[PDB]
Amino acid sequence: ATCYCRTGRCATRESLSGVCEISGRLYRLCCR
Numbered sequence: 293a294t295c296y297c298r299t300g301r302c303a304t305r306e307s308l309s310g311v312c313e314i315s316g317r318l319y320r321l322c323c324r
Contacts, residue, residue, distance in 0.1 A: 294323060301320060301322075302324070
């Protein structure tokens with residue numbers, strides 16, 4: 293799969309691995 297941070301929820305196929313941190317803002321890490 294491909295883990296990456298995004299500004300919000302990801303797709304169903306993706307998988308949350310943890311909470312990212314970008315620009316001081318918390319991001320969501322999803323893996324697909």
